[PDB]
Structures are given as structure tokens and as C-alpha cells.
Amino acid sequence: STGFPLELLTRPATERLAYFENYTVAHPRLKEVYEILMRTIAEPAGASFIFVYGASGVGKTTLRLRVEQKLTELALPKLESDRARVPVVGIEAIAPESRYFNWKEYYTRALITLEEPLIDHKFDYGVRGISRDNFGKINVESKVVAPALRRALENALIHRHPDVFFVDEAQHFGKVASGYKLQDQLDCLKSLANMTGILHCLLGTYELLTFRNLSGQLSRRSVDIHFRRYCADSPEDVQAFKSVLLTFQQHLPLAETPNLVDHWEYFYERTLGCIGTLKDWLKRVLSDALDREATTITLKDLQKRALSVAQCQKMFKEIQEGERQLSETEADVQNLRSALGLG
Amino acid sequence: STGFPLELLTRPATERLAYFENYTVAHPRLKEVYEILMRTIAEPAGASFIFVYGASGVGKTTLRLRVEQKLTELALPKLESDRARVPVVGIEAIAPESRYFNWKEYYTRALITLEEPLIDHKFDYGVRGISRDNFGKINVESKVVAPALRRALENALIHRHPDVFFVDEAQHFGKVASGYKLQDQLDCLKSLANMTGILHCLLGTYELLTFRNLSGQLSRRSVDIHFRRYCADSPEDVQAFKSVLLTFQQHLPLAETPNLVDHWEYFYERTLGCIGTLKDWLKRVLSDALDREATTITLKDLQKRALSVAQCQKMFKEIQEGERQLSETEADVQNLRSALGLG
Ligand SMILES: Nc1ncnc2c1ncn2[C@@H]1O[C@H](COP(=O)(O)OP(=O)(O)OP(=O)(O)O)[C@@H](O)[C@H]1O
Ligand SMILES: Nc1ncnc2c1ncn2[C@@H]1O[C@H](COP(=O)(O)OP(=O)(O)OP(=O)(O)O)[C@@H](O)[C@H]1O
Ligand SMILES: [Mg+2]
Ligand SMILES: [Mg+2]
């Protein structure tokens, strides 16, 4: 069967909700961005940054988790032979309590997450304020100044040498006091990625576009991957949206499978084409239905957990400007050729 | 009987006052918002923020207490089998002495409130400045830096795994000096919630409409719940108000029950729908009557301890403003249709 297994009906509601949460759908934009990101990670070729953009609601975190699991399963063989290796280190940024991004906390979080191997691996890292303990945890005292933590992290990254270093919600790097300090933050990240030779991938929303192009050097060592949303004007995106709606409808653990493609305009209105938002909506509706133990779904249940107009309006305002900034037309090529003299 | 038991008459005035105080009537808005919040926190589905909007008069605090007691009741059978878990934890935001909201005090109070289980559960928290003591209390040294407290609170939240984190009086987070500080405060809350995977429900007054819509990320990961007051235009609202008032009249531990529905216009004038205002007004009047051992109260008794006009109009100015912004009309729905192209 192409839908949910029928035997889930006898089993209670909790496992049905668990199955729907653990269920993941494949849609053309996700697979295209996934293959592009995997190709870029497989070899950076002098690149130190990947700026993956996309709306609030797209699949960026799920894409990151899928990439990490794929790379781990790819590397496990070589891990069976060569020890002291971590394939992927994936980290999320932290919004600071103060107005300036805390580099010390970023460095100590990197040390914490990066170094969780079997205790057999010992490296007595530089600076005397960082050491192991009786439980395998990494001990970082406040006495350790930030540059010392940077040096220790550089040593650890150089030895372990992960294939890619994920920085989720990278837009938190913009919390700075000086306007010009944005380029300084990006330069600090670039310098960290230079002497370590570790590919840094920056996962962020459209707020990350403030870092998109600063200085020629950062432009050279970065690639722009756009996790575009399924638009409404292009018919093919509409067909993809209807296909993913049907795929979701097939895997709804209900006694009766609801008809869902019919009300696709409402779904596009309240999700803007982002698959994550639609999955959230359907998860909420399914949870409500399973709580009521009703056979099937209705538009009513849909409206109860629907995103309100005001919050959905703000998202599209953010998305409209972000896509406008990231829009590359054939005309833009013409001025580039005209300026260079290739016209 | 549907009212107070008659045995309370023999008991002194203190016992009758206690019985009326611990009594909590139920009204359609209360039960509706309670069910909506229960279904929202039964599963968050990728949502990190709940914005319970309501005037200082409804019943936000008692709704929070009801939710905590309900979930505490629900989690007892699993607690008897599994230790090291807290069903629900919640605190109240602190208005800071200085200009800026103090994150250190917020973090330390959250850690204090969350970590009050039986003394068997030892998790040897991170940061050397956090530990237990001879009396079982959690001691927080002033030398502990704020990010260290944040990491310790994160580890405690992950290990204990609460169902929902309540932040009452959440409008206190707006004590900022920069326009963008207003936003990265909520960004810090969102980072704390994401990194722990814990839903954060924010109960606050209409001042929280400031935190309503900031950027697509916080617009998506938040669901707005409006604790609307019983207005005067809706006949159903008037009927519900009169039913609640009649239940209050029947539940007064008085020797002779007075007729309360007569001065419904006066009661709505001095309460404008807030059930809590009516409740504590009636508590005031009943206590004043019981002080003089009178068999009944009078209009002048209500007038003796009512709410003055100067304040009463002040909530109206705030309330009509918040209800104005929180008004979602069909015109806004069609505006999304035109902008997105689904018209
Ligand atoms: N293709 C997909 N199939 C199934 N579920 C998906 C898919 N894409 C996203 N989700 C759902 O989205 C949620 C994860 O968040 P998601 O990756 O969509 O966030 P994002 O909007 O890309 O990132 P951010 O948090 O930075 O805004 C989960 O509930 C997950 O089930
Ligand atoms: N439905 C209710 N039945 C009985 N008493 C109620 C009810 N709702 C509120 N109260 C009373 O209101 C008081 C608690 O304050 P309440 O939660 O109503 O205030 P609020 O203005 O909504 O919020 P806040 O605490 O932020 O000021 C208590 O005296 C409680 O008895
Ligand atoms: Mg995400
Ligand atoms: Mg209250």
C-alpha cells in the first residue's frame, strides 16, 4: 500500500501520532537542495561557507538532520578502521541575552558538542582550563579567555576534521552593537574555518541575507543555496503542492481517509507553500481528531488550529523581500558582462 | 442544592469567607480557553510560543493554576513508575529594579522552581557554582556568569522534560532601551525553547501585544490565544455574564440570598466583563457584610467598595486597543488572497 498501514487502527492513538511525527515526505525542492548540499559538502574546493536561506517553515532543520545521518552512515565504514574521527558536527546558534553575540559561549558549546567520543580518545587540549572529568564531560571554567577557547577548538577541529560543520539558525550572528561589525563577525568565522580547513555551513532564515555578500573574499569562499518555497504563480509548483497534499492525505492514520487536495487554496493561504508549516497544521489536526477519536477530518478542525491572518501576513512580508533580494535575473548578467568588457 | 451548603451558617465568618474564596465558578469563555490551551499544549507540533492575551481582570492566573493542577493529576501514574520527571513548571516574570530585564534572576528563579523534586534525584548539574546543600535547596553563587546559568537551566530542562513552561506576567519582558532589543529578547526566549524542545506559554496582559508579530520565524512558531472579555454588544455575552452573576449570587454563604441580577448594568460598568473583577468585588462585599454580621448586603455596600471611575475607564482604554489589534476580519483574509495570488 502507498498509504499508512491499516494495522495501526487497532493500536491506540499515541502510536499513530508517533508514526505521523516520524513520517517524512519527499518533495522536489527538498531533494534538489539535499543533492546540491551533499555535492557541495563532498568537496568544498576552497569554499568555507554555505549560506542556505529559506522561509520560516521549509525543512531546513530536517534537511540538516538528514544530511548528518547520511554522512554518518557513509562514514561508519571508515570509522570502523580509523578511530578519532567525527564525520559531522552540527551546532545551532544561541541568541545572546545582551546585545552582542557571545563568542565565548559559542566556543564552549562547540567544544562540548564536538568532543563526545569514546573516552579512549585523549588529546589533553591546549590551555590548562579545559579538561575531561570523571563522567566524560568537557569542563570549561570561566577563567578561560575566549581566544584560548578558540585555540583549543581549532586544535580539536584540525585533528577530528569533520566533513562539514553545521551552524543552524545562523541569523543570530547579526546581534552586534556596531553596524560594520557584521563583516567582522563573518571574518572571525572565516578565520576559524581557514586554519582548521573545516567546511562551515550556515543554516539561517532570510534574516541571514545581511551576511550574504560582504567583501570580495567572503563572496569567493561562500556558495548560496536557496531553499525556495513552492510559489503560486508557476503551475508546476502548484502541482507539487497538490502532490504533497495527496501524499500527506494517504498517510493519515484514520479510519476514513479525508479528501484534502480539494481545499488546497486554504492550505496555501495559511502555509505559503512551506512543507513544514503544512506538516505542523496536519499534525495538530490529526492530534485533535485522535483525541476526539473521530473517524475523519473536516475544514472545521482545520480552522481551529489554523495560523491567524496577521502572523501569516508578516511571514509573507519577510518572504517577499527575501526572495526579491535573492532573485537573479538574466539582466543582472548583462551588467556584469558589460562592466567586465565581455559584452 | 446548586448553591452554598446551609451548614456554613453555623461556622464563623472566616470559614464562610474561605469557602467563598476557594470557590471558582466556570464560565463559557473560561472553559473554551481552557480546552483550547489543553489541546494546544497536549502537543506543540513545532510551536515554541503560546501567547495568552487577556486583560487584567479575566482569569489568566487561575487558568494557569487549573492547567498545572490538571496536568499534575494526569502525570501521577507515570511518576509513580518513572522518577526524575516534572509534569509542569511555571514562574512569573520579574519587573527589574534597573532599566533592563535581568536575565540572571530569570534563569536562577527558573532553576530554583524547576529543581524541587525529592532529594534522591541527583544530576550533578554543570557549572561548579550550582549544586545542592545540606537542606536540599539549590544554591546559586553570584560568581556564576549568565551563560553558565543558561546552560545549567538547559540541561535541567532537557533531563526533567516538562510538558510546558509557564511564564506568567510575561509583559515584564518589554523593559528594554533599544527598539531591536525588544525583539532579541523574544529571540533569546525562542533559542532557550528550541535548544530544550519545551513549549513556552506566555500569559500576560495586553501589553504583550508588543511581542505579537516580529519576523516570520517568531510569527510562525507562535500561536495566539485571546482570553476575550464578555462584551455588552453580544446578547450571548450578556446572557453568560448574567448566568455567572446568578451563580455567584447563589453561592454566597449568606443567611438570606439577595437579588443580584438587578444591578447588572452597574456590575458591568465597574467590571466591563472581567470575571475576576466581579469575583473579588463580591469577595470584598461579602467580607464587609460578614464583618458586621448582617443578614444581607445592599447597593451601598457594593458602592462602598467598588472600582472608581478614574481607574475603570483606564482598563477600557487598554482593552479596546488590544481588542482592536487582535481583531481578525474577513477583509484581512481576502487581503492575503490578493497578495498571495489565490483570489
Ligand atoms: N519534508 C518534510 N516532511 C515531513 N515533515 C517535514 C518536512 N519538512 C519539514 N517537516 C516538519 O517540520 C518540522 C521541522 O521544522 P522545519 O525543518 O520545517 O523548520 P524550518 O522552517 O526549515 O526552520 P527554522 O526553525 O529555522 O524556521 C517538523 O515538525 C517536521 O516534521
Ligand atoms: N472563573 C473564575 N471563577 C472564580 N474566580 C475567578 C475566576 N476568574 C478569576 N477569578 C478570580 O480572579 C483572581 C485572580 O486574578 P485573575 O487571574 O482573574 O486576573 P487577570 O487580570 O486575568 O490576570 P493577572 O494575574 O495577570 O492580573 C482570584 O481572586 C480569582 O478567584
Ligand atoms: Mg527548522
Ligand atoms: Mg490574574
Tab-separated table of N, CA and C in Angstrom, chain A residues 224-299:
chain	number	residue	atom	x	y	z
A	224	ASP	N	25.789	30.022	-2.367
A	224	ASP	CA	24.431	30.390	-1.973
A	224	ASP	C	23.474	29.296	-2.433
A	225	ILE	N	22.859	28.616	-1.473
A	225	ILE	CA	21.819	27.633	-1.752
A	225	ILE	C	20.495	28.208	-1.269
A	226	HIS	N	19.505	28.246	-2.154
A	226	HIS	CA	18.213	28.854	-1.860
A	226	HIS	C	17.162	27.760	-1.730
A	227	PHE	N	16.637	27.587	-0.518
A	227	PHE	CA	15.541	26.650	-0.271
A	227	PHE	C	14.237	27.377	-0.581
A	228	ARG	N	13.956	27.504	-1.876
A	228	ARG	CA	12.786	28.245	-2.316
A	228	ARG	C	11.502	27.535	-1.896
A	229	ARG	N	10.481	28.336	-1.619
A	229	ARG	CA	9.155	27.835	-1.299
A	229	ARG	C	8.378	27.584	-2.583
A	230	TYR	N	7.387	26.702	-2.497
A	230	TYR	CA	6.528	26.420	-3.641
A	230	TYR	C	5.625	27.618	-3.900
A	231	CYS	N	5.931	28.374	-4.950
A	231	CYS	CA	5.177	29.572	-5.281
A	231	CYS	C	3.820	29.199	-5.874
A	232	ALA	N	2.970	30.208	-6.058
A	232	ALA	CA	1.630	30.007	-6.592
A	232	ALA	C	1.498	30.353	-8.066
A	233	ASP	N	2.359	31.226	-8.592
A	233	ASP	CA	2.233	31.636	-9.986
A	233	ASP	C	2.637	30.518	-10.938
A	234	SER	N	3.737	29.833	-10.648
A	234	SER	CA	4.218	28.772	-11.525
A	234	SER	C	3.340	27.536	-11.372
A	235	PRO	N	2.728	27.036	-12.450
A	235	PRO	CA	1.839	25.867	-12.308
A	235	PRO	C	2.528	24.635	-11.746
A	236	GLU	N	3.804	24.420	-12.078
A	236	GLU	CA	4.494	23.217	-11.615
A	236	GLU	C	4.605	23.190	-10.095
A	237	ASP	N	4.820	24.351	-9.474
A	237	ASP	CA	4.830	24.409	-8.016
A	237	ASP	C	3.459	24.066	-7.445
A	238	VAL	N	2.391	24.482	-8.128
A	238	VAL	CA	1.042	24.133	-7.687
A	238	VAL	C	0.825	22.627	-7.774
A	239	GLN	N	1.293	22.005	-8.859
A	239	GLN	CA	1.188	20.553	-8.975
A	239	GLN	C	1.986	19.852	-7.884
A	240	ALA	N	3.179	20.360	-7.571
A	240	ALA	CA	3.966	19.775	-6.488
A	240	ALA	C	3.250	19.911	-5.149
A	241	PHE	N	2.638	21.071	-4.903
A	241	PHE	CA	1.884	21.274	-3.669
A	241	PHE	C	0.717	20.300	-3.575
A	242	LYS	N	-0.016	20.116	-4.674
A	242	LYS	CA	-1.122	19.166	-4.667
A	242	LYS	C	-0.624	17.740	-4.467
A	243	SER	N	0.522	17.401	-5.063
A	243	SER	CA	1.075	16.063	-4.900
A	243	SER	C	1.469	15.796	-3.454
A	244	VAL	N	2.117	16.764	-2.802
A	244	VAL	CA	2.500	16.556	-1.408
A	244	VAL	C	1.268	16.554	-0.509
A	245	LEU	N	0.234	17.316	-0.873
A	245	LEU	CA	-1.019	17.257	-0.125
A	245	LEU	C	-1.639	15.869	-0.217
A	246	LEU	N	-1.654	15.291	-1.419
A	246	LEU	CA	-2.175	13.938	-1.590
A	246	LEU	C	-1.333	12.922	-0.826
A	247	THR	N	-0.008	13.085	-0.854
A	247	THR	CA	0.872	12.171	-0.134
A	247	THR	C	0.615	12.234	1.367
A	248	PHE	N	0.432	13.443	1.902
A	248	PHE	CA	0.064	13.582	3.306
A	248	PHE	C	-1.284	12.933	3.587
A	249	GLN	N	-2.259	13.143	2.699
A	249	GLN	CA	-3.587	12.573	2.891
A	249	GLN	C	-3.550	11.050	2.913
A	250	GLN	N	-2.676	10.441	2.108
A	250	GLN	CA	-2.603	8.983	2.067
A	250	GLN	C	-2.098	8.407	3.385
A	251	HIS	N	-1.193	9.113	4.062
A	251	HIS	CA	-0.561	8.616	5.283
A	251	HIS	C	-1.145	9.249	6.539
A	252	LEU	N	-2.456	9.485	6.568
A	252	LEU	CA	-3.115	9.960	7.776
A	252	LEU	C	-3.726	8.764	8.494
A	253	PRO	N	-3.247	8.398	9.684
A	253	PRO	CA	-3.758	7.190	10.347
A	253	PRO	C	-5.178	7.356	10.862
A	254	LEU	N	-6.146	7.349	9.949
A	254	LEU	CA	-7.552	7.491	10.291
A	254	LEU	C	-8.340	6.328	9.706
A	255	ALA	N	-9.496	6.054	10.315
A	255	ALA	CA	-10.369	5.006	9.797
A	255	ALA	C	-10.828	5.327	8.381
A	256	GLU	N	-11.163	6.587	8.124
A	256	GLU	CA	-11.521	7.059	6.794
A	256	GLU	C	-10.494	8.091	6.352
A	257	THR	N	-9.974	7.928	5.142
A	257	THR	CA	-9.005	8.877	4.614
A	257	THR	C	-9.728	10.131	4.139
A	258	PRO	N	-9.444	11.298	4.711
A	258	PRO	CA	-10.135	12.516	4.282
A	258	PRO	C	-9.669	12.977	2.911
A	259	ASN	N	-10.551	13.713	2.240
A	259	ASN	CA	-10.239	14.357	0.971
A	259	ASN	C	-9.632	15.717	1.292
A	260	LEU	N	-8.383	15.923	0.874
A	260	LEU	CA	-7.621	17.081	1.318
A	260	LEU	C	-7.189	17.997	0.182
A	261	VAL	N	-6.984	17.456	-1.021
A	261	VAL	CA	-6.495	18.256	-2.139
A	261	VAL	C	-7.518	19.308	-2.551
A	262	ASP	N	-8.802	19.058	-2.282
A	262	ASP	CA	-9.852	19.970	-2.730
A	262	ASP	C	-9.678	21.360	-2.127
A	263	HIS	N	-9.396	21.432	-0.830
A	263	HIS	CA	-9.210	22.720	-0.161
A	263	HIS	C	-7.742	23.139	-0.155
A	264	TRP	N	-7.099	23.109	-1.324
A	264	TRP	CA	-5.671	23.410	-1.379
A	264	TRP	C	-5.405	24.908	-1.289
A	265	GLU	N	-6.358	25.732	-1.729
A	265	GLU	CA	-6.172	27.178	-1.665
A	265	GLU	C	-6.040	27.652	-0.223
A	266	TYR	N	-6.862	27.108	0.677
A	266	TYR	CA	-6.757	27.453	2.091
A	266	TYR	C	-5.405	27.042	2.661
A	267	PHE	N	-4.929	25.849	2.294
A	267	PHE	CA	-3.632	25.384	2.774
A	267	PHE	C	-2.510	26.292	2.291
A	268	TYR	N	-2.553	26.696	1.021
A	268	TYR	CA	-1.528	27.604	0.521
A	268	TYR	C	-1.625	28.963	1.201
A	269	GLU	N	-2.846	29.427	1.476
A	269	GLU	CA	-3.017	30.692	2.183
A	269	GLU	C	-2.372	30.651	3.560
A	270	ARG	N	-2.590	29.572	4.305
A	270	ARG	CA	-2.133	29.501	5.687
A	270	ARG	C	-0.781	28.820	5.850
A	271	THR	N	-0.126	28.430	4.756
A	271	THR	CA	1.202	27.837	4.826
A	271	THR	C	2.212	28.467	3.881
A	272	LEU	N	1.766	29.209	2.866
A	272	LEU	CA	2.634	29.904	1.917
A	272	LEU	C	3.531	28.947	1.137
A	273	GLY	N	3.166	27.669	1.067
A	273	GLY	CA	3.934	26.691	0.331
A	273	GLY	C	5.007	25.980	1.126
A	274	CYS	N	5.266	26.401	2.362
A	274	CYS	CA	6.267	25.733	3.182
A	274	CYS	C	5.740	24.387	3.659
A	275	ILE	N	6.510	23.329	3.399
A	275	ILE	CA	6.070	21.981	3.746
A	275	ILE	C	6.024	21.803	5.259
A	276	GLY	N	6.965	22.416	5.979
A	276	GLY	CA	6.980	22.282	7.426
A	276	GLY	C	5.733	22.839	8.085
A	277	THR	N	5.266	24.000	7.619
A	277	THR	CA	4.050	24.587	8.177
A	277	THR	C	2.842	23.693	7.928
A	278	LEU	N	2.739	23.128	6.723
A	278	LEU	CA	1.631	22.231	6.415
A	278	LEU	C	1.698	20.964	7.260
A	279	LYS	N	2.904	20.434	7.472
A	279	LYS	CA	3.057	19.267	8.333
A	279	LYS	C	2.644	19.588	9.763
A	280	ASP	N	3.017	20.772	10.255
A	280	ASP	CA	2.588	21.216	11.579
A	280	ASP	C	1.066	21.279	11.660
A	281	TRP	N	0.439	21.890	10.654
A	281	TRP	CA	-1.014	22.011	10.629
A	281	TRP	C	-1.686	20.645	10.663
A	282	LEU	N	-1.241	19.732	9.798
A	282	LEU	CA	-1.853	18.411	9.738
A	282	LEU	C	-1.589	17.624	11.012
A	283	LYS	N	-0.419	17.815	11.625
A	283	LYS	CA	-0.133	17.163	12.896
A	283	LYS	C	-1.097	17.629	13.977
A	284	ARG	N	-1.339	18.939	14.052
A	284	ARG	CA	-2.282	19.463	15.036
A	284	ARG	C	-3.683	18.917	14.793
A	285	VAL	N	-4.119	18.917	13.531
A	285	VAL	CA	-5.466	18.445	13.215
A	285	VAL	C	-5.606	16.962	13.542
A	286	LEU	N	-4.590	16.165	13.206
A	286	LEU	CA	-4.635	14.737	13.495
A	286	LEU	C	-4.632	14.477	14.994
A	287	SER	N	-3.853	15.251	15.753
A	287	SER	CA	-3.866	15.098	17.203
A	287	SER	C	-5.248	15.393	17.770
A	288	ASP	N	-5.889	16.463	17.289
A	288	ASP	CA	-7.238	16.774	17.756
A	288	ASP	C	-8.217	15.661	17.399
A	289	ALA	N	-8.142	15.157	16.165
A	289	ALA	CA	-9.059	14.108	15.731
A	289	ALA	C	-8.872	12.839	16.553
A	290	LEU	N	-7.619	12.459	16.810
A	290	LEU	CA	-7.360	11.266	17.605
A	290	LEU	C	-7.788	11.459	19.053
A	291	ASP	N	-7.685	12.686	19.574
A	291	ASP	CA	-8.234	12.960	20.898
A	291	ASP	C	-9.742	12.761	20.915
A	292	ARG	N	-10.436	13.249	19.887
A	292	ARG	CA	-11.875	13.036	19.801
A	292	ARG	C	-12.238	11.645	19.297
A	293	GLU	N	-11.257	10.864	18.838
A	293	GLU	CA	-11.483	9.511	18.326
A	293	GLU	C	-12.490	9.498	17.180
A	294	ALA	N	-12.528	10.576	16.402
A	294	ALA	CA	-13.434	10.663	15.267
A	294	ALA	C	-12.852	9.931	14.067
A	295	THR	N	-13.721	9.360	13.244
A	295	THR	CA	-13.263	8.678	12.035
A	295	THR	C	-12.409	9.543	11.105
A	296	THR	N	-12.864	10.748	10.770
A	296	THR	CA	-12.122	11.560	9.794
A	296	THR	C	-12.137	13.075	10.044
A	297	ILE	N	-11.446	13.806	9.171
A	297	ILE	CA	-11.157	15.228	9.351
A	297	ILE	C	-12.158	16.127	8.628
A	298	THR	N	-12.227	17.389	9.045
A	298	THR	CA	-13.080	18.382	8.403
A	298	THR	C	-12.426	19.753	8.376
A	299	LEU	N	-12.953	20.653	7.553
A	299	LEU	CA	-12.410	22.004	7.478
A	299	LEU	C	-12.502	22.688	8.828
